[PDB]
Amino acid sequence: HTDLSGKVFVFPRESVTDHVNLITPLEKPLQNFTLCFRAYSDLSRAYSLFSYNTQGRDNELLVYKERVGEYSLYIGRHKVTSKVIEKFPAPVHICVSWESSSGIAEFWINGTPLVKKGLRQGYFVEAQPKIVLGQEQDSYGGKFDRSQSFVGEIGDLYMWDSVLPPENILSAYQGTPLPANILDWQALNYEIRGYVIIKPLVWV
Amino acid sequence: HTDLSGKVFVFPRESVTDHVNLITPLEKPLQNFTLCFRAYSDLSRAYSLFSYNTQGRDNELLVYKERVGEYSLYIGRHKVTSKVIEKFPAPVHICVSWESSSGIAEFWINGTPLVKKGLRQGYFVEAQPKIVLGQEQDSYGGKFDRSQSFVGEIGDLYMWDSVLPPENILSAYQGTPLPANILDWQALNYEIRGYVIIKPLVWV
Amino acid sequence: HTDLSGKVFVFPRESVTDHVNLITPLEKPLQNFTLCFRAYSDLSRAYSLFSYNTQGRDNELLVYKERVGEYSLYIGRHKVTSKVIEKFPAPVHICVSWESSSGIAEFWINGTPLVKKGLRQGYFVEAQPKIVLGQEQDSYGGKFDRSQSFVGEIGDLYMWDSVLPPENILSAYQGTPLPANILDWQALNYEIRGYVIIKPLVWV
Amino acid sequence: HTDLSGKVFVFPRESVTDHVNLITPLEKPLQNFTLCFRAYSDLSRAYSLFSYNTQGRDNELLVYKERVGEYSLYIGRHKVTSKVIEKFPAPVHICVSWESSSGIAEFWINGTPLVKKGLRQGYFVEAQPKIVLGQEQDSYGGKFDRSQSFVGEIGDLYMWDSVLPPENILSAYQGTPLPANILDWQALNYEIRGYVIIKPLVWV
Amino acid sequence: HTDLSGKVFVFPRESVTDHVNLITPLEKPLQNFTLCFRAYSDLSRAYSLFSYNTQGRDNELLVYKERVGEYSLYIGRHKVTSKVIEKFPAPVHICVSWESSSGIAEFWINGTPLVKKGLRQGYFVEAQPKIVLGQEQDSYGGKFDRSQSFVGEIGDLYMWDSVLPPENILSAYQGTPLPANILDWQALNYEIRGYVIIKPLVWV
Amino acid sequence: HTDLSGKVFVFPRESVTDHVNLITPLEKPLQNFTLCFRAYSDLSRAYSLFSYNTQGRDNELLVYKERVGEYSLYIGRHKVTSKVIEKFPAPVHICVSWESSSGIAEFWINGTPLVKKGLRQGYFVEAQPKIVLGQEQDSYGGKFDRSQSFVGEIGDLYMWDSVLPPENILSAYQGTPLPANILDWQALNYEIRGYVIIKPLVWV
Amino acid sequence: HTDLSGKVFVFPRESVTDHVNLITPLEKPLQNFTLCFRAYSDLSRAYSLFSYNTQGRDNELLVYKERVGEYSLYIGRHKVTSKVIEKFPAPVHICVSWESSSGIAEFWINGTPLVKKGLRQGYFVEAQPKIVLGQEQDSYGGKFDRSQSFVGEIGDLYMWDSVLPPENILSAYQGTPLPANILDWQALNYEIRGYVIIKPLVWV
Amino acid sequence: HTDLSGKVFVFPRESVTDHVNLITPLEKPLQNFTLCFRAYSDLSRAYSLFSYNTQGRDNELLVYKERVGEYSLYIGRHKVTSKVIEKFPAPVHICVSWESSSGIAEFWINGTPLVKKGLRQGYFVEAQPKIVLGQEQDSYGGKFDRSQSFVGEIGDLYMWDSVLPPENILSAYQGTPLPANILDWQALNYEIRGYVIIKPLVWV
Amino acid sequence: HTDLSGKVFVFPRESVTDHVNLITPLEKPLQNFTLCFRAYSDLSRAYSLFSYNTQGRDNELLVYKERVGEYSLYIGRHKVTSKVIEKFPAPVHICVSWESSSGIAEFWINGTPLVKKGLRQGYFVEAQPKIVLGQEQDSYGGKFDRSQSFVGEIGDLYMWDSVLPPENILSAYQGTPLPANILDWQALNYEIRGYVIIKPLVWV
Amino acid sequence: HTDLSGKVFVFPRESVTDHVNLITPLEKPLQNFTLCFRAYSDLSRAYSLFSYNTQGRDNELLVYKERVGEYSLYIGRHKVTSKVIEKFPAPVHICVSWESSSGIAEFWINGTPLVKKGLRQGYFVEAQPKIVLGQEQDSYGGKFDRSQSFVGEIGDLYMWDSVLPPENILSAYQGTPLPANILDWQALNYEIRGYVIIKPLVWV
Ligand SMILES: [Ca+2]
Ligand SMILES: [Ca+2]
Ligand SMILES: [Ca+2]
Ligand SMILES: [Ca+2]
Ligand SMILES: [Ca+2]
Ligand SMILES: [Ca+2]
Ligand SMILES: [Ca+2]
Ligand SMILES: [Ca+2]
């Protein structure tokens, strides 16, 4: 595992090929979770930000940006969509949390709460995943789509197994995130495939 | 009755199912009233904020959002609509007051006064009502419409049987409202139906 | 005569009947004059602010709003128009002065001066008029048009027999106006017709 | 010679006759120069600000507005056009300089330099001119266009026989200009023909 | 080697002939670089800022502007494009970096980093260049296009044979740049051909 | 008394001065009427076809066209408006009837009937009138607006004192109308002022 | 008992008062029905062609036009709509057929079948109604809307107690309709309230 | 089997219920096929004409209309799309063929050939299907989507297990198609489920 | 003089150089005159068809196509315009007449008369000209504008010194040209300078 | 050589792969030529119709469609574009002929001639080419652009080494082509690479 503090993945071109595979020791199905990251991209079209897929289950947990100012979370095939006023193009902090008990999805865009939505209440998101940046999975770790590929910069990725409160969300955005127990940027297990470069984060 | 301080009703999906029934000790005809609440919704279409139907009469008192910037009030089937500059999506604090003797409707958005309109001078909204949040009523307690459903977050709801002065309306917006006698958030008799969850209010 | 300080004429509904008659101690033809008042309405179509009609003479003096950000002045059937940047909807302070010798119509919105216009050099505006508020006059005190009817909140109406210099115009905008000779808000002779209520001024 | 300190020219109507002639005692071929003035108009269509014509040749020196945000200078029939972001309507202050040795047109809207242009290198603007204000010359002091006329206010017009360096440019805008030699607003020789009045400058 | 500190190349008209040739001491193939300059123009259409061609190789290194808010870097015929929010017209500061080893192309606009792109990894830009301003090359030093011509103001041009850290980019932006070895505006060898003037930089 | 068969009244330039005064010796208060004419005009803006004004009264009878395919009638200040599908530009034949008692307006464009409209029941249009071809009146023979001026060709103007039946209107459309008792084209007492020329009909 | 062959109801103006009350000897609940009529109107906005209401039941039977090319039919508060290519404005022949057993509504425009719709299977429309023309009913005989008023020409109105087959539809459109037994234009019981006239049918 | 000559299936309303199950003697997997039917619908949105699904294979064979003048055939999940000029709404005759050896899809709209497209060369469409009309399956016989439902009329359905040449396709269009051996309208087996009525074909 | 019957001058490319000089044996100043020619050009932007310039006189007589379906005739600098229905792009025949005593210019596009227009009533154009085809003149025989170059095909160019009657205009269109007195296509003296080719007329 | 009489190449999908190579024994530079074919496609975007590349030479003889109603020819990198009224989508016969002596590019669409254009006067198009259908060469035989690929049907391709007179172009379109010396459809040497099927021509 690597300390990626002050660095970002750069997905420098539109492709069916460039991705980073995120390795996790998660053997337990997910009930609660929070996911945080920082994105910079000037893509007009729809792209995937974070693709989490299990065997036989496509789109198990997916953060997808369908268009400017519109953020989508997919749990177990089902989706929710929340809107927001945002400048284009701009760097963005994104935190999404979901909760099996309440079904509640919680988007935070730059430490600002989006409208809460709800999906898949009681659903247990399956374990032993394949997580990928830069590409949207249609298979277990494969079947990428070019017109869905991410091009731009991603960093400060943290993933917890619990619903973070507003303070802790604001902590991540302000630059001091609680040590995360599923995916931790400062101790990250990644695999680069194709054209992706690690560079200093300068748009912060 | 329950203390709902620092909590909201969240209507996480669009449906014809989800609503919240509000129960009020009111056995009295409404000469004067003021109704206040905090809403937060990213709907482009039209929706209902507060549905007040009585015994055979539809839309006896109704607060309806026709589009962005356009807040309507219905008294006994009759309509008044006042416009305002607002950002979308964005949280809003609505107050609406009505007087019988003058017919004057008074809309207040985020502590700012809207253009006065008038309707049903020398009339009274009927007693023993069925009050629902999250859907619009075409019957006494039912007949909901999907394209009228509220999906988002409502909180800090109060209803007085008086026309609250500007200072008092401002005090509700500032987060310290005066105890109410019809509907009170700090003592609300409610009934959840379908999919509505109580989460802490995070957008203030 | 009655003191209307901190109170406004609200025209709460679109109508063809509801208006307010103003009878002034005017017995001499007008050479120089200034009309100043406050208005708050979310009406989007054309409407009349101040109608001044005499026997056999149409629109001898008319303060008219064609659209948003465009204020017209009719003097003896002649027409002048000036544009300005303004928010909609938003309360406005309208001031209009006209000189006979130079023909110069002066327009002031929110204390800011608009482009000087000119009309009817060496012309006397008629005496013994019938002044209505909330409606437009096609005949001597009657013949209203429903699509020209003002619906909103008018207030602080003042009229002088002299062309007001800039310092005095600003004085009117702050809320400390100079003693008016023709029409005064603190001493007004008015006739109420149809639906028109007098409520306190809140939008200032 | 007339002192016009704190005064403006108003052309109060769309006309074909209203113009202000300006006499200048200079009878030398023009090498370098600078022209500053102020203007307050609400015209959507094109209009001529300043017109400088000699015997037998059209547009020896014409400052022309094409539309909102576009300003043009003519040097002997030849044209240059520079753009800027501006409010409409809004009072404007235009300084322009043309150097014969370099052809450099230097536009300054409200003390901000617009992109420098170039035209007619090694050319002399002709002596014995007829300068008009409020109209556009097509013959020597005649042949006017109704669709090019100026309606609005004009003041603080000063003309030097040198290219005024950016420091002195600002001095003019701030209200305290260098004493001019070609045309002085403090000591002007002008001629009113038609409907155009003298009024004090109220819009600064 | 002339100190052009506080002066700008002004391309005053649209032409297919007017350009400036920059001579560089560079006979080691380019591997890494930074390019910084200021640009003031009101052109709506597409235009080249900087053209670097070698024998038999078109668009070896080209900084090109498709439209407002869109900047393109060309390396070895290949292209990347990044987007920005920018006012028009407005004085702009540009730095672009490139680094064969990673292929990352790094655009900075007025001190703001755009989205990093990537082109030609393992490629080195040919030496023995002919560098032009004000025109776009389609051959070795010639073949100009009138629709591609740059009209406006260019100053404070610098070029380094290294990728500049974020710091040094801002050092350049705020008018105290680092010593450059390829192209130095304080010691630039240049040839003016056709119509292009040197005048003081007054929009900073 | 002048035979105008195969002749038109070309209004060749847009103006404020050029008008043709149509005089009739009918001193009877008009009960029923019909009016025919051909016209040719490539004006996209609004204009007046036929103006009728009396003592102290505006637009007692008026045939006005707001926009392509829209024709409107005015009787004693009141309006009616009917639409039709036409080409542009298009040589047009227009006839209109008004039966006082039924108050019915009968537009007959190009031999095809329009949707009937109703105005001023129990009304008789006045006598001793001033009728103008080529301008729009807002006074007794005066007050003309350039933006209401007609420019183009007008021909075959006939006018009867009774409401013409369908069969009779068709006859007029062919080019063989019945003898008119008020306004005969084969016997028209007219008056030319300014630029308006006679030329043979070539379009029909 | 009135033979209105070759005659129409002309509703000549927009109003809240003008209508025709249709009286029918139908005192049995309606299982099947066919309604045909001709209408000429250049109205752009939504209006009501045929209004049929019963005791305490709104919109029992209603032919309503939402816009150009869109035709609606209401059977007991329930709605169905069907679209058609049509010239605007133009005269139209409408046929609507309803059949309770299947629910199938059948719209025939100018003798052309629209797409078949369905509503209220096994339902009987109420007996003993009030039928109005020219206005829309919100109550039993009254409660009209100006923004729903019909203006134009209606004729050849027939209503049968059975579902009419094509040949008979084409017969009605052709001009020789089969004898009707609810409403018969050739022997109609009509009542004019307000401004509606009877004029010849000319537009066929 | 049922003879459906001169009759249509009418889908009277937007639903997630109303479907016709079609049943067929196909137990050999499809290699070649032609499909023809007549549809009449005013539905603006996307809908399925013909849905054919096998165990665990969705959209095995599907004719789907995305928008106006756009027809799509899906074979084995893959799709092809061809465009056509067509009036809306209007009755349409669709033919579509597919040939496995070439992979060519052939569309015919009103006897006119569209652009040939190719997909799934060498593929066999699976036997033992579920064919539904009115709805679009996502499961084997079920899981319908409301916004994909067909409302309108379908008739003259025929399916062969061969690729028909133009003559036969143009014969099918004209009215006399040759005995079809997969689905044959003149000997059809069907299950009506929900709201769908059999009514005579009136629009051909 | 050479025979050009069934032959055309083609202007194959946009240029600032390609033109056709037309020399005429005309020392007589034009009083009444008519000019006819055929054009085939797919140019969207404005262009000149027929430039006629005299010593020290710009645009003495000039046919200038402003845009599609818009033909302008310049006479002695002054401007008239007429619009017409036409297909783009399409071969066109344009006849233009003008009468000195009338100022009436008549346009005949393809044989249809356009709206008569008037200018310079009482003017005679100068003799000793320089007629150019393909270019717009700014001086006596030169100073071309590239944005006005005519690129396309011109055939059957004729010019008479008399106002041709409608029947002779229609003869000219059909290819039966009356013997020309000024400019004859069957016997034209011409000078070709630049890139312009002679081809047979194939688009009639 | 193969007799492709009555057959087409169907390029059934968008690819960067599928193309037909055309093989001719051409060994001498082409002074003149005529190329004709039938094309059917619903492609909205730009595409190549016929790419002809020699060694080291790109776009030597290219027919390329930029958009609807706009046909282009490239000779030695240089281009011409001629526009045409056409329906989309629609089958089309294209004939292009270029003449070196004159430079004349002549385009024929469905027998109708477009505006003649001109390029590369005196040029000779190189021998030993590489002729492809379905794609667009950037190199000698390859370097395809998907965003430029042809997808549709293509047939009746014939190429002569002469410039055809109108009667032979017409005869080609009518279906009886003059025998061709370079490329003959009735004896074609082709190379299919990828996915292109031969189907019988049905759209004529
Ligand atoms: Ca009036
Ligand atoms: Ca001029
Ligand atoms: Ca280049
Ligand atoms: Ca007028
Ligand atoms: Ca109703
Ligand atoms: Ca010229
Ligand atoms: Ca010119
Ligand atoms: Ca190429």
mmCIF file of N, CA, C and O in Angstrom, chain B residues 33-55:
data_model
loop_
_atom_site.group_PDB
_atom_site.id
_atom_site.type_symbol
_atom_site.label_atom_id
_atom_site.label_comp_id
_atom_site.label_asym_id
_atom_site.label_seq_id
_atom_site.Cartn_x
_atom_site.Cartn_y
_atom_site.Cartn_z
ATOM 1 N N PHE B 33 -54.821 32.634 9.793
ATOM 2 C CA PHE B 33 -53.758 31.651 10.005
ATOM 3 C C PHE B 33 -52.413 32.088 9.444
ATOM 4 O O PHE B 33 -52.334 32.998 8.620
ATOM 5 N N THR B 34 -51.361 31.428 9.920
ATOM 6 C CA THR B 34 -50.011 31.560 9.391
ATOM 7 C C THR B 34 -49.411 30.161 9.370
ATOM 8 O O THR B 34 -49.510 29.422 10.351
ATOM 9 N N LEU B 35 -48.808 29.792 8.247
ATOM 10 C CA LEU B 35 -48.194 28.482 8.108
ATOM 11 C C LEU B 35 -46.744 28.630 7.667
ATOM 12 O O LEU B 35 -46.461 29.310 6.679
ATOM 13 N N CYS B 36 -45.836 28.000 8.415
ATOM 14 C CA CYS B 36 -44.397 28.105 8.165
ATOM 15 C C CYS B 36 -43.691 26.752 8.179
ATOM 16 O O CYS B 36 -44.015 25.886 8.995
ATOM 17 N N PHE B 37 -42.734 26.586 7.263
ATOM 18 C CA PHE B 37 -41.919 25.374 7.161
ATOM 19 C C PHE B 37 -40.674 25.570 6.291
ATOM 20 O O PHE B 37 -40.585 26.522 5.506
ATOM 21 N N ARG B 38 -39.721 24.655 6.443
ATOM 22 C CA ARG B 38 -38.505 24.634 5.646
ATOM 23 C C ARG B 38 -38.588 23.479 4.661
ATOM 24 O O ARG B 38 -38.697 22.317 5.061
ATOM 25 N N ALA B 39 -38.550 23.803 3.374
ATOM 26 C CA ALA B 39 -38.545 22.792 2.327
ATOM 27 C C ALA B 39 -37.203 22.774 1.588
ATOM 28 O O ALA B 39 -36.467 23.768 1.592
ATOM 29 N N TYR B 40 -36.896 21.634 0.966
ATOM 30 C CA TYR B 40 -35.671 21.450 0.187
ATOM 31 C C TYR B 40 -35.909 20.337 -0.819
ATOM 32 O O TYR B 40 -35.947 19.159 -0.457
ATOM 33 N N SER B 41 -36.081 20.729 -2.079
ATOM 34 C CA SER B 41 -36.454 19.821 -3.159
ATOM 35 C C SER B 41 -35.763 20.230 -4.452
ATOM 36 O O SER B 41 -35.656 21.423 -4.753
ATOM 37 N N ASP B 42 -35.307 19.242 -5.217
ATOM 38 C CA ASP B 42 -34.748 19.507 -6.542
ATOM 39 C C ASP B 42 -35.686 19.089 -7.682
ATOM 40 O O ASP B 42 -35.242 18.510 -8.679
ATOM 41 N N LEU B 43 -36.973 19.396 -7.536
ATOM 42 C CA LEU B 43 -37.951 19.103 -8.576
ATOM 43 C C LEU B 43 -38.119 20.264 -9.544
ATOM 44 O O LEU B 43 -38.291 21.415 -9.136
ATOM 45 N N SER B 44 -38.066 19.948 -10.835
ATOM 46 C CA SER B 44 -38.347 20.926 -11.886
ATOM 47 C C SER B 44 -39.853 21.097 -12.075
ATOM 48 O O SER B 44 -40.339 22.207 -12.274
ATOM 49 N N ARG B 45 -40.585 19.989 -12.006
ATOM 50 C CA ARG B 45 -42.033 20.004 -12.177
ATOM 51 C C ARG B 45 -42.764 20.681 -11.017
ATOM 52 O O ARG B 45 -42.135 21.189 -10.083
ATOM 53 N N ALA B 46 -44.094 20.697 -11.104
ATOM 54 C CA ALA B 46 -44.953 21.262 -10.068
ATOM 55 C C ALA B 46 -45.188 20.256 -8.940
ATOM 56 O O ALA B 46 -45.269 19.055 -9.191
ATOM 57 N N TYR B 47 -45.284 20.745 -7.703
ATOM 58 C CA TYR B 47 -45.569 19.881 -6.554
ATOM 59 C C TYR B 47 -46.299 20.598 -5.415
ATOM 60 O O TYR B 47 -46.422 21.824 -5.416
ATOM 61 N N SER B 48 -46.788 19.817 -4.454
ATOM 62 C CA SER B 48 -47.540 20.346 -3.324
ATOM 63 C C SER B 48 -46.713 20.370 -2.045
ATOM 64 O O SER B 48 -46.025 19.400 -1.716
ATOM 65 N N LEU B 49 -46.809 21.476 -1.317
ATOM 66 C CA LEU B 49 -46.092 21.637 -0.058
ATOM 67 C C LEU B 49 -46.941 21.258 1.152
ATOM 68 O O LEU B 49 -46.421 20.663 2.100
ATOM 69 N N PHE B 50 -48.234 21.598 1.112
ATOM 70 C CA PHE B 50 -49.126 21.484 2.269
ATOM 71 C C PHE B 50 -50.598 21.338 1.844
ATOM 72 O O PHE B 50 -51.229 22.305 1.402
ATOM 73 N N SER B 51 -51.137 20.126 1.997
ATOM 74 C CA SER B 51 -52.477 19.793 1.513
ATOM 75 C C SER B 51 -53.504 19.683 2.641
ATOM 76 O O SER B 51 -53.416 18.808 3.507
ATOM 77 N N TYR B 52 -54.487 20.581 2.590
ATOM 78 C CA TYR B 52 -55.484 20.772 3.630
ATOM 79 C C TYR B 52 -56.854 20.616 2.979
ATOM 80 O O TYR B 52 -57.338 21.531 2.304
ATOM 81 N N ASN B 53 -57.457 19.442 3.161
ATOM 82 C CA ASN B 53 -58.788 19.145 2.632
ATOM 83 C C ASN B 53 -59.742 18.807 3.757
ATOM 84 O O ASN B 53 -59.369 18.147 4.723
ATOM 85 N N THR B 54 -60.979 19.267 3.637
ATOM 86 C CA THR B 54 -62.006 18.897 4.604
ATOM 87 C C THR B 54 -63.210 18.259 3.942
ATOM 88 O O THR B 54 -63.469 18.450 2.757
ATOM 89 N N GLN B 55 -63.900 17.456 4.737
ATOM 90 C CA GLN B 55 -65.282 17.048 4.520
ATOM 91 C C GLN B 55 -65.958 17.521 3.218
ATOM 92 O O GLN B 55 -66.671 18.530 3.202
#
